């Protein structure tokens, strides 16, 4: 996250920190995700496409730091890794950039709500906030696009939803963005998501409910003028989410 503020997991308790085990036993951060039910985390396929094996991955909930344990965290294995079979990218755009991870602790349990862990509501079919709405993003992504290290404490910021018309202006992204995506950014272009924030939530009030409106997906650079974040538009993926999370 460029700009914004250091926060703690209590303030974004649906946030999932996803890591990969390496040959050697070294563990590195992959991407963010969001807890949408006790057993289910949603993320972005591009995060996993290179190494699509569920056994590689660890999911933490209730965790506020990147490479240190925090009180209230819980650790999970990935029981099912579901990538979108129509995932595709051009030079910049990612289509169907959506993944599901079924989580299970070694003791065979799903998540339990606590002061540090809560699910986030999915929107109803095609139900999105009006453009101009202020939403939140969060993650362990770069604080500056030129940095080589990642912040060790979770960050969040506020960005505003941009109309399709405006985002489909040529000096924005043109026809790179579809009805299956949402653009969001800072009016003054000083705060944004960045590398490392992929798969994490775009969270908006809607129905007076904190709602997973988007998943961090793509953009050109980070915090560049007329170059918003592009998010997978959750309200348009309910059937995919339904046909892949049946109990």
């Amino acid at each position: 996250i460029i700009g914004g503020e250091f926060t703690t997991i209590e303030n974004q308790p649906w946030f999932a920190a996803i890591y990969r085990r390496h040959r050697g036993g070294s563990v590195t951060y992959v991407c963010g995700g969001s807890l949408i039910s006790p057993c289910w985390v949603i993320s972005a396929t591009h995060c996993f496409i290179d190494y699509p094996k569920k056994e590689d991955y660890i999911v933490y909930l209730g965790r506020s730091r990147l490479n240190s344990n925090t009180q209230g965290e819980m650790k999970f294995e990935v029981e099912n890794l579901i990538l979108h079979k129509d995932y595709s990218a051009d030079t910049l755009a990612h289509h169907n950039d959506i993944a599901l991870l079924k989580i299970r602790s070694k003791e065979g349990r799903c998540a339990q709500p606590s002061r540090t862990i809560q699910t986030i509501a999915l929107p109803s079919m095609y139900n999105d906030p009006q453009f101009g709405t202020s939403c939140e993003i969060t993650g362990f992504g770069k604080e500056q696009s030129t940095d080589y290290l990642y912040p060790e404490q979770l960050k969040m910021t506020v960005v505003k939803l941009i109309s399709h018309r405006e985002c489909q202006q040529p000096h924005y992204y043109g026809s790179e963005v579809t009805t299956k995506m949402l653009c969001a950014a800072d009016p003054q272009w000083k705060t944004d998501s960045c590398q490392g924030d992929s798969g994490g939530p775009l969270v908006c009030s809607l129905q007076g409910r904190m709602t997973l409106t988007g998943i961090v997906s793509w953009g050109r650079g980070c915090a560049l003028k007329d170059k918003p974040g592009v998010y997978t538009r959750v309200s348009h993926f309910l059937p995919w989410i339904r046909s892949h999370t049946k109990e």
Binding site: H22, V30, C31, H46, G141, S145, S198, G199, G219
Partner: peptide, 16 residues
């Protein structure tokens, strides 16, 4: 680059 890279296909990343 390496297999230890964070979010290699993310925005601003090598393959974003």
């Amino acid at each position: 680059c390496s297999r230890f890279v964070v979010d290699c296909r993310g925005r601003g990343g090598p393959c974003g």
